[model samples]
Target: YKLFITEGYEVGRVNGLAVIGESAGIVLPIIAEVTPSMEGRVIATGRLQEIAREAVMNVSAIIKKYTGRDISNMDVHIQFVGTYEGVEGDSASISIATAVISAIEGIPVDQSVAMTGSLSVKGEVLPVGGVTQKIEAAIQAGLKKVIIPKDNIDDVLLDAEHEGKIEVIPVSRINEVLEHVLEDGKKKNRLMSKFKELELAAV
Candidate 1:
């Protein structure tokens, strides 16, 4: 829970937000790692439980589309943990996607930042519910910046005490999220260029 929320950076460790019920939000930590797979598979386990098979298949397809890296050719383990039950859902998609792709490309994400949004199969960042609650959770977690879907930018409504505690960044696609979350360097730059050109043909 709060233990995983810290400063600095790591390869696949990412901070994602989720709601306890209708209003309260909490941070969900994700860790993804990939390796050569004689038996290529995605494994998920955490304090809460495991990821659904259908969910895995979709996220697996999402990574393949966004990263152009065939996860089916690699061994994968994704550790997604939440502080409480029913605290996991679409809100973590962007975070898990970031963690999975970052793990594949060996890019480290900024720990000071946290993200909440659902990632579509086309690499678009779909809006999530409870945007206001999630932002409040990010602020409470001591995150420096919170990345939310562009569509939800207007959904955020901060109060007096919570105002300006954390910077809010709105994004429309997976590339934009990476642009903000990834640690700066030549390595990250190269990947950005690749992501830039991986544009889909259809509208």
Candidate 2:
């Protein structure tokens, strides 16, 4: 699984009117299941600049394709916690996907485990900004695990020099996340666990 923000823009103004702008920020990062031997992508997309209403359209298509259910018929709700607080970026994509996936899959992911990344239409994971702030927020919220982009591992590790056991797993795609967060032992791979390492011999 992955999360994203389609684009960046200011939402409010000192004069009380609204404004929309542009940002060079990347959207979201997906957690596709990547292993040494078998590799694949989940194939999905979510946009950040999309309105809350339009978000349903993309999510509906996703459910129809993967779960074969009408978007309306699906028992799901959307919520965005936290405030704009004058800071702006494209980290909401992870937060959005966290809520949606948790609701749809009926899995209990810790709200403490907040995510922020760019997701590809093909389910490839992309890096996002605000790495330090994001991880700090997660730790402050008492989350034990924080999944980050493979590219962002160094950022987390740098911070870890002063932090504790915050399990920051590096992922390259969304399928990898689904295997662990949504399913049981069947999808478990050696790369997914420390005790279990998938050993493959190349001919």
Candidate 3:
């Protein structure tokens, strides 16, 4: 069934686009929760458990430096809702990161936006496959925006009818994805400032 929510905001939940077969895409929602733990640990389930684990590992690298939250003392749990017999790829990396950050900081993610990208440990948003089909899935689910890797912008070849249906945001980094999806608030502002500082330091 379709599990996409097109309006409002949610903490610890994100709409992630995934491709099925070779041409069709579907919405894969991820729910995240963080709790105190003796040591840092990431828990994930479903057919794509390995991909989830890797995503969390890469995302944690950025989360620790960005928030200075001592994530090492927390247990992060990621859950993929609905059923899929088999799932592949790490395209949900950005979604997983967004969900965990929202959970830890109590920030809400905009449900009108869907995201797909692979994340690197250095906070880069890497490109993924089926970008065109993924955008179609988001539009069909009534999402207002879709975040894709900047490199994949050239890969998305949408038809005339679907071209302007949704706002396409091409991001080169994970922080940009956060900026687009997180609800506006003081906390969001602070988090963004941290990202800005990180960016300035890199240059």
The list of candidate 3 runs beyond 4 A from truth reads 201-203
lDDT of 1 by residue, 1-203 (tens): 35565688899888888778767888777888888896587776543334323334556775666557777888777776644666656633778778877888898999888888887666778898888988898888888999999999889888999997999999888888899989899989988887775454323
Model 2 ranges off by over 4 Å: 1-61, 72-77, 89-92, 157-161, 180-203
lDDT by residue for model 3 (10-40), tens: 9999999887776688888889999999577
Q: In angstroms, what RMSD does candidate 1 have relative to the true structure?
A: 2.6
Poorest lDDT segment (10 consecutive residues) of candidate 2: 10-19
Residue 111 accuracy (lDDT) in model 3: 94
In angstroms, give how far residue 126 of model 1 lies from its true place. Answer: 0.3
Ranked by TM-score from best down, the candidates are: 3, 1, 2
TM of each candidate vs. truth:
0.87, 0.54, 0.94
Off by over 4 Å in 1: 46-67, 199-203
lDDT of 2 at 82: 24
Clash counts per candidate, in order, are 0, 23, 0
lDDT of every model, 2 decimals: 0.77, 0.40, 0.85
